[PDB]
Amino acid sequence: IKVRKMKAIYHTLNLCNIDVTQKCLIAEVWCPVTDLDSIQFALRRGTEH
């Protein structure tokens, strides 16, 4: 499970923009409107970790 998630996460980051345009990663996503706050809270967890 560890290695499979790691592989999936890296393959997902592949889909995102790279330093060819900016040192900060750019991500594009579909999201339901109601879950935007939850996604922001998840990003907050990511920042803290």
Binding site: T21, Q22, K23, C24, I26
Partner: protein, 57 residues
């Protein structure tokens, strides 16, 4: 705007690139400054040794 923010990030990255380029240019020119400034120190050494030699004589 999203495009406005992306352009702002790109401009900031360009500013950072300019900063690092300026620092590299400073290093490159200070290399020649290092080449040249040794003349002052060698002159100081020569003058000090001449003073000591003449005093001893």
């Amino acid at each position: 705007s999203q495009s406005q923010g992306i352009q702002q990030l790109l401009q900031a990255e360009k500013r950072a690139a300019e900063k690092v380029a300026d620092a590299r240019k400073r290093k490159a020119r200070r290399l020649k400054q290092a080449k040249e400034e040794a003349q002052m120190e060698v002159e100081q050494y020569r003058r000090e040794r001449e003073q000591e030699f003449q005093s001893k004589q």
